[PDB]
Amino acid sequence: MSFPKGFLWGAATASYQIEGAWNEDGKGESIWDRFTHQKGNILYGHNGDIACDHYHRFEEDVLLMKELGLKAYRFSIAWTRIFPDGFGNVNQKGLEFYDRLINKLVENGIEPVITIYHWDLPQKLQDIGGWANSEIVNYYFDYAMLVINRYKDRVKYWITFNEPYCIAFLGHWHGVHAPGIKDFKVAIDVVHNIMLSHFKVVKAVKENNIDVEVGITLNLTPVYLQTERLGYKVSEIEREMVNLSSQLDNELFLDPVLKGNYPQKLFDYLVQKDLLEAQKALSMQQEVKENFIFPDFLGINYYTRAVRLYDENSSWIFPIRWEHPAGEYTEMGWEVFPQGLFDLLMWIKENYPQIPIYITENGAAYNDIVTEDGKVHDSKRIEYLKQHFDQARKAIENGVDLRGYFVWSLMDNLEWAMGYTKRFGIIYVDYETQKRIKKDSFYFYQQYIKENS
């Protein structure tokens, strides 16, 4: 089986993780500027003030993409470069920068794929509630249509949101991401405002006849039962509670994006447990059904699975615990489990309406060292990628409409609250000299593209 003719072999980045220049050219403060400037949020006190300095070095970075042979490149636009206050006046230097990057990409025959919101909310919008405030829907819509209408001639693929689960729960429940809020009820409100924001943009693109594909990116985690790994008999309560726990990861976002409702089992449980007010639950259901519209594609960030079992003494919002199967793990503590990419893709094809799928993020963090002859022999990353590439091809053979694959990441970068301690790039970045050093995985990916395109 071959990959289909125009398969988008890509790599992926996000603005706050690579761009630096956090306050040049009138760029507004984002919630991640504020978050990394507070003590105790980021390992070793790292921040994204400089990052990979991609704001200044983007030309050389695009030439490495041309050397790599990428068919596409996924990046995000920093909202605070365009609207320093979230609302208000447009900033010309911000538009100028993305104008130059997008044109350099088109110039070198690389399809741009743009994530509109990749977590860097204007701090001025946080100051009036951020994503917990329903007016955010319109502030996001005005920003999203400005960049779609400006770039639609050069950019055919648009992603409204990257990983809503994180924006909501890690940003507003666990408090481990910006804005650092800790309130499950605010987190659900965030989930809702994101869905409405996503719907309003998709509808605007269809109604105005704008010839672009618009999608959304969800991080999905196939959940497996420890009991079934052990060959025990699965009780019905255990299956019920593990499925509730996996609806919080996956169906809570797939269901409204692809079917126009939230998952009913989860909502009942959350209401029963006083985690979610019953009126909001009915209101959210009503508002999503009214505003729902199908997207043009689904983006899937896949890294690993979860193995879970039932436990009535758990401190989690569901009575479950996590188990740790034997095998290979990364610097993230994530099981290397390529079969989960295939199972997930088959599970998507069989449970939701037909839709084109792109793997918009997949990759692995290993503790890379530069050798004496300036190489980086990341054979563990090569093995990770090779095995997941193979599951993707296998899924295509089984009828999954998989149209692209974007490796995370093109270059080492700031890994949010882990700082720069986790390297995901196929390109090593020396953060003291900003030198880019192609890892061995760069040449493997280069060869894999050449022979599957």
Any residues with CB less than 8 A from the CB of 341 and at least 6 apart, and which?
A: 302, 359, 362, 388, 391, 392, 395
Q: Whose CA is closest to 155, among 82, 117, 203, 106?
A: 106
Distance from chain centroid for Cα 81? 20
- For the chain, list the domains and their CATH numbers: 8-225+294-310+330-450 (3.20.20.80)
SS3 215: strand
Q: Is the CB of residue 289 less than 8 Å from the CB of residue 195?
A: no
* Residue 214, beta-bridge partner list: 158
Alpha-carbon gap, residue 382 to 370, rounded angstroms: 16
Angle among Cα 123, 124, 128 to the nearest 5 degrees reads: 105
Q: Are strands 436-438 and 427-429 parallel, antiparallel or unpaired?
A: antiparallel
Q: Is the CB of residue 424 less than 8 Å from the CB of residue 30?
A: no
Q: Is the CB of residue 378 less than 8 Å from the CB of residue 366?
A: yes
Q: Is the CB of residue 13 less than 8 Å from the CB of residue 74?
A: yes
Name the method of structure determination. Answer: X-ray
Give me Rg for the CA atoms of the chain: 21
Q: Whose CA is closest to 167, among 31, 348, 331?
A: 31
Return the structure tokens found at 97: 């920068």
DSSP string of 45-93, one letter each residue = G--SSSTT-HHHHHHHHHHHHHHHT-SEEEEE--HHHH-TBSBS---HH
DSSP string of 371-388, one letter each residue = -TTS----HHHHHHHHHH
Return the structure tokens found at 167: 């924006």
For residue 260, count other CB atoms closer than 10 A to its CB.
Answer: 17
For residue 447, count other CB atoms closer than 10 A to its CB.
Answer: 11
For residue 110, count other CB atoms closer than 10 A to its CB.
Answer: 21
Q: Which helix (H) or strand (E) holds 158?
A: strand 157-162
Total number of residues shown for the chain: 453
Alpha-carbon gap, residue 263 to 184, rounded angstroms: 17
Q: Is the CB of residue 208 less than 8 Å from the CB of residue 189?
A: no
Phi and psi at residue 422, to the nearest 5°: -110, 120
Q: Whose CA is closest to 387, among 348, 339, 427, 349?
A: 339
Alpha-carbon gap, residue 105 to 289, rounded angstroms: 38
Q: Compute CA distances 58 → 20, 45, 103, 194, 431, whole Å.
A: 11, 26, 12, 30, 15
| Residue showing tokens 């149209």 | 403
Q: Is the CB of residue 381 less than 8 Å from the CB of residue 426?
A: yes
Alpha-carbon gap, residue 396 to 2, rounded angstroms: 9
The residues annotated with a catalytic role in the active site are: 163, 361
Alpha-carbon gap, residue 315 to 273, rounded angstroms: 14
Phi and psi at residue 436, to the nearest 5°: -95, 130
Return the structure tokens found at 65: 């993409």
DSSP string of 248-262, one letter each residue = IIIIHHHHHHHTSS-
Alpha-carbon gap, residue 21 to 18, rounded angstroms: 10
